[PDB]
A paper describes a structure:
Cyclodipeptide synthases (CDPSs) use aminoacylated tRNA (aa-tRNA) substrates to form peptide bonds between two amino acids yielding a cyclic dipeptide product (CDP). ParaCDPS from Parabacteroides sp. 20_3 (GenBank: EFK64745.1) produces cyclo(His-Phe)8 whilst ParcuCDPS from Parcubacteria bacterium RAAC4_OD1_1 (GenBank: ETB63777.1) can synthesise both cyclo(His-Glu) and cyclo(His-Pro)9. ParcuCDPS belongs to the XYP sub-group of the CDPS family, characterised by the presence of 3 residues: X40 where X is a non-conserved residue, Y202, and P203 (numbering respective to AlbC). ParcuCDPS displays a Rossman-fold common throughout the CDPS family.
Inspired by HisRS and histidine recognition more generally, and by the only high resolution structure of a CDPS with a ligand bound, we systematically altered three unique residues in ParcuCDPS P1, which we hypothesised to be participating in crucial interactions with the polar side chain of histidine. We first designed Generation 1 containing seven P1 mutants (Y55F; Y55V; E174A; E174H; E174L; Y189F and Y189L), and these variants were cloned, expressed in E.coli, purified and used for activity assays. By mutating the P1 residues, the activity of the variants was vastly reduced with E174A and E174H incapable of tolerating histidine as a substrate. The impact of mutating Y55 carries more weight than Y189, suggesting it may directly interact with the histidine residue via a H-bond rather than adding to the polar surface. A similar pattern of residues interacting with the imidazole from histidine is seen in HisRS, in which two tyrosine and a glutamate residue mediate interactions with the nitrogen groups of histidine. Further investigation into the changes imposed by these mutants was performed by solving the crystal structures of a select few mutants containing changes to the active site or the pocket residues. The mutant structures were able to be solved using WT as a model and retained an equivalent fold to ParcuCDPS (Supplementary Notes 4 and 7 relating to Supplementary Figs. 13 and 14). Therefore, the disruption of activity is caused exclusively by the change in these few residues which appear important for the enzyme to produce a CDP.
Author numbering: 1 to 4, 10 to 60, 70 to 230
Write the structure that this text describes.
């Protein structure tokens, strides 16, 4: 389990976030645990564990995920960690729920995306196509009202992937993830302003989240 400048991680200049995709088959407890091992070694100081995407007891879909499943996932993770790591390692690990991340400043960026999603048909159309591709991987089908529902849900997590955000007071500049996805490619074009440049102009600050590709 090693990372795919190069010298910045081996200079341990960044705090590392472990972005978990709930329900993704790769994110077993063992792989999560190995991602936490790697991050504790290479981090500046803290390791942040959080729920990244999710591909009605709340008006927020990420908040809904957090309370239906993210809680019990975090509990299993804490159990495993308390057996696999020493006391001094565990004090470096922060469990960040959706609420910890989606403070007032964060929600402003989401609402900007929501606004763009309704007023700008090309953004809506492009976001909608994202969902339609993910559906086609499945043996399930979805209607256009569902496809459009799930596109809004991406916008809710889109700022955390692009911008450096605090959680429980802690800015984490980098996050580990085992593979490139259509999402990480899109975020890279956004950050560079190569696609939908009004997004960069509005909700980015040239403090881009560093994506570290770490897998076995």
């Amino acid at each position: 389990m090693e990372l795919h400048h190069k010298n910045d991680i081996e200079l341990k200049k960044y705090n590392i976030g472990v972005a978990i995709s709930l329900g993704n088959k790769w994110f077993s407890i063992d792989n999560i645990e190995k991602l936490v091992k790697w991050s504790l070694l290479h981090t500046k100081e803290y390791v942040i564990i959080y729920i990244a995407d999710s591909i009605k007891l709340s008006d927020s879909h990420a908040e809904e995920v957090a309370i239906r499943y993210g809680r019990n996932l975090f509990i299993k993770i804490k159990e495993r960690v308390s057996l696999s790591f020493s006391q001094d390692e565990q004090a470096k690990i922060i469990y960040a729920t959706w609420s910890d991340i989606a403070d007032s400043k964060y929600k402003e960026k989401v609402k900007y995306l929501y606004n763009l999603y309704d007023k700008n048909i090309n953004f809506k159309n492009y976001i909608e196509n994202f969902v339609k591709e993910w559906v086609s991987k499945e043996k399930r089908t979805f209607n256009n009202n569902e496809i459009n529902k799930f596109g809004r849900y991406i916008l809710e997590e889109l700022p955390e992937l692009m911008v450096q955000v605090k959680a429980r007071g802690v800015l984490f500049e980098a996050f580990v993830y085992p593979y490139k996805t259509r999402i990480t490619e899109f975020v890279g074009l956004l950050q560079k302003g190569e696609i939908f440049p009004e997004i960069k102009t509005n909700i980015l600050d040239n403090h881009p989240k560093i994506f570290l590709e770490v897998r076995e």
